[PDB]
Symmetry: C3
Subunit: 119 residues, 3 copies
């Protein structure tokens, strides 16, 4: 059946606020593979990419039922796109077959939802 | 399998407007237990809490298929938090095990989604 | 059983208006003949809300389908119909005999939708 579901909406402006006000924010949210892509983007695209990843990982953590913390790190979750451009999640704590995700954007927001199934 | 799904996004300012214009708005949306929690919150927190509950119950009513009205009241739905802080719904019209919810917020919005499974 | 894919979309009403104004028969491109009949019956404001909602639903469906809108799936391959209570449901014959669930929501400035396709 369904193990859990998660939804997150993130304001891009906030991601810009949290980002600069640190100096380690993007690197804490993104994995090595994600960072490789992130560093090639323009300032504008970087914010959209980071906001999208942040939302997807937050949604995943909610579906997981614990949120980000001691039981689950942003580094434990990686978003990729298949050959059709569809995002999917790989998480070292469960089978990718049990996970579904969707990501969307508007000028000012990034949002994502995740559904985890019990196999 | 899946019986129904529901999504809702609610503008905090609209909630605050209705709460100011309407008599007993919080009392109409919240159960006794939620009201007890609501009344211990600051003015700002109250609006966020209320908007989140409203979004969650709206989402639930859409998944249930009846919407809020004669067949289902806001009073028939209660959101609780487990030991990890994860929200879950209690509605005696169905088993708690068949329901899954997720709630999110931004500065100006509250949003929620629900998935009800057939057991 | 099991979930085939999920999709989420948030669309800015102002952007739909911006696209509908500067473009050809934008509404005609997004909507099927039956949706158009419903569309033409609405006021200027309602048309924008209706179009944004249907657009969000088709985008969300395209994301659950896993390809997005394009060569593999057209806006015209997806139809949002209304049941006896005026609530939306999706018909996509291009989709194997699977079950499709959809939920649409609105705020003053946005339209949003989510879809779950079960295999
Ligand atoms: Cl946010
Ligand atoms: Cl990738
Ligand atoms: Cl997606
Ligand atoms: Cl926007
Ligand atoms: Cl549904
Ligand atoms: Cl609203
Ligand atoms: Cl009591
Ligand atoms: Cl949640
Ligand atoms: Cl906001
Ligand atoms: Cl948009
Ligand atoms: Cl439906
Ligand atoms: Na890192
Ligand atoms: Na709303
Ligand atoms: Na947020
Ligand atoms: Na959008
Ligand atoms: Na529905």
């Amino acid at each position: 059946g369904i193990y859990g579901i998660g939804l997150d909406i993130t304001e891009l402006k906030r991601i810009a606020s949290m980002a600069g006000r640190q100096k380690r924010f993007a690197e804490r949210i993104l994995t090595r593979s994600e960072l490789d892509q992130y560093y090639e983007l323009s300032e504008k695209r970087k914010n959209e990419f980071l906001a999208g990843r942040f939302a997807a990982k937050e949604a995943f953590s909610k579906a997981f039922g614990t949120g980000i913390g001691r039981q689950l790190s942003f580094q434990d979750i990686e978003i990729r796109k298949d050959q059709n451009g569809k995002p999917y999640i790989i998480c070292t704590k469960l089978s990718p077959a049990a996970v579904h995700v969707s990501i969307t954007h508007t000028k000012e927001y990034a949002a994502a939802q995740v559904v985890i199934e019990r196999l």
